[PDB]
Structures are given as C-alpha cells and as structure tokens.
Amino acid sequence: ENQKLIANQFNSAIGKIQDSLSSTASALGKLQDVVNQNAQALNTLVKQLSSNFGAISSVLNDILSRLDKVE
Amino acid sequence: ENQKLIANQFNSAIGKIQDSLSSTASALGKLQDVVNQNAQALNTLVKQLSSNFGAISSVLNDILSRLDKVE
Amino acid sequence: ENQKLIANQFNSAIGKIQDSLSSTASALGKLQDVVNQNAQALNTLVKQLSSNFGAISSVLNDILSRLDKVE
Amino acid sequence: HTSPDVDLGDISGINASFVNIQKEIDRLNEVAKNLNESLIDL
Amino acid sequence: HTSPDVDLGDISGINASFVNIQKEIDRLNEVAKNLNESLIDL
Amino acid sequence: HTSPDVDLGDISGINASFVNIQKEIDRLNEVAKNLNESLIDL
C-alpha cells in the first residue's frame, strides 16, 4: 500500500518533470532561433551600413573635388 | 524504515527540482525580456537610420543640384 | 525487492535529472554570453554610428558654408 | 552638364524578430507549483 | 543668401540591455550537485 | 587650394556572435524521453 503510494507519486512527479523538460527544450530552441535571427540582422545591418558609408564617402569626396575645382 | 527513507529522499529531491524549475523559469524570463529589448533597440536603430539616410540623401541631392547650377 | 526497484528507478531518474539540469545550465550560460556579446555589439555600433553621423554633419555643414560663399 | 542622383542602399527591410516563450515559463512555474501534489505523505 | 543647418537625428539614446542570469545558472549547477545527497542507499 | 579627404570610421569589425545550444536541447529532449524508462512498475 505504501509502496503503491510511493510508486504512484514517483510516476506523477516523473511525468511532470518530463513536461518541464520538454517546455525548457522548447523555450531554449525558440530563444536560440530568435537570438540567431537578431544576430544575422545585426550583421546584415552592419554590412549594409558599411556599403552606405562607402557610398557617402565617395560622393562627398567627389563633391569636395568639385568645390576645390570651383574655388 | 526503508519506506521512510525513500519518502524523505524523494521529498528532498522534489524540493530541489522545484527550486531548479523556478530558477530556470526566472532565467528564461530574464532572457526573454533582454532579447526582446535588444530586438526593439535594433528596430528603433534601423528606423532612425533610415530617417537619417533619407535626410542625408536629400541634402546631398540639393548640394549636387547647387553644384550643377554653379558648374 | 520492490523497495530495491523503487530505489534503483529513483536513482536512475535523479541521475537523468542531474544531466538535464547541467544541460540547462550550459545552455543558459551560452545564451547569456551570446546575448551580452550582441548587446555590446549593438552598443558599439550605436557609438560608432553617432561618431560617423557627427563627422558627416560637420562635413556637410562645411560644404554648405562653401556653397553659400560661392553663391 | 548634369548630376547623377545618389540612391543609398535601403536598409528598412532589416527587422529583428521577437521571442515569446511565456507559455513555457508559465508551464515551468505551474509544474514547480504542482510538484507539491507529488510529495509522499506515508 | 544663407544656408540652413542640417541636424541629423541623434540616435545615441538607443541602448542595448544586458542579461545577468548568473545567479540562476549557479543555482542550477548547485542543485545538480546537491541531488547526489538525495540518492537512496537502502 | 586643396581639400582634405573625409575618412569615416570603419565599422565592419562589429560582428554579432551566434549561439549553438542544439546539443543541450537534444540532450533535454533525450532525457525527457528516457525518463519513461525510470517509471516504476511494481
């Protein structure tokens, strides 16, 4: 009787811990996905910003050359 | 006697696992908060950068028009 | 006999839960490290972008002054 | 004489996803509370 | 004749928070170590 | 008369790390599956 109680409580606890482990795995997977997506977003933003600043640098350099020619 | 030992060890283990589950939930909540805040920060930065590059584009376009008028 | 079965199953479950807790701690540590590194990256990017936009602002202001002097 | 326009690379497409693991945090807290119903009282 | 100044939108306010869950990782490792004190030795 | 070049601060060094905790997620799911082998059947 006490052994049946111990076994039933243990099986209940193991089921609840299995649920908790599946929930933790799901949450960690979602966090990994979102963190990696935002890392890729930051890298893409840095690349596009480097390109845009290169373009801005070139255009202002041409403009400074034109101003030098004028004055 | 052995049943009391089994029950005591099981209750101790269940208490420790409850502590671990609360700690995991707290850590996952903090990670979610920080990840969402940095995502919002990246989005705000992208919006402000789009605005700033629009302004830069307009100003350099006006400047190129002025240079064209001069030369 | 049943007590030995209960104790063996409980020890097996506690070992597996110890493995799961170590895995969760490792994953949370890695997530913390990566999230903090990307936060530092976003902050460094914001600082460098503020500097670059200050430089761009100064250069276009000088250029607008030159255009004003010309015309 | 003319002046070519300057079109900067549009970056508005860069979007940062959000995470929603509140179901899992709620389930973890719920299990940490329900495990009190699994304690043995001989 | 004049020239209007160009004031770009200041973005220095955009700050990225940091996470500190080291207490929780330490507690998880501590419990994974202390669970050896809950093993049954009949 | 001359014109000093304008060199903007290079930001290409700013890189965002990636996280790989797939081993740990796989281990968590594996343990959540293997805990069925620890159930007591008197």
Residue numbers in the entry:
A (entry chain C), B (entry chain B), C (entry chain A): 918 to 988
D (entry chain E), E (entry chain D), F (entry chain F): 1159 to 1200
The authors write:
Most of the hydrophobic residues of HR2 are involved in hydrophobic interactions with HR1, with only one exception—V1176, which is completely solvent-exposed. The V1176F mutation, similar to the wild type, remains solvent-exposed but slightly displaces Q957 on HR1 and also decreases fusion activity. We observed various effects on neighboring residues for the D936Y, S940F, V1176F, A942S, and the Omicron triple mutant. These structural effects correlate with changes in fusion activities for these mutants —the D936Y and S940F mutations result in a loss of a salt bridge along with a decrease in fusion activity, the V1176F mutation on HR2 slightly displaces Q957 on HR1 along with a decrease in fusion activity, and the A942S mutation introduces an additional hydrogen bond along with an increase in fusion activity. The fusion activities of the D936Y, L938F, and V1176F mutations are ∼60% of that of wild type, while the fusion activity of the S940F mutant is ∼25% of that of wild type. We determined single-particle cryo-EM structures of the five selected single mutants and the Omicron triple mutant of HR1HR2 using the same molecular scaffold (NpDps4) and data processing workflow as for the EM structure of the wild-type HR1HR2 bundle. Overall, none of the five single and the Omicron triple mutations dramatically altered the architecture of the HR1HR2 bundle, as indicated by the small RMSDs between the wild-type and the mutant structures.
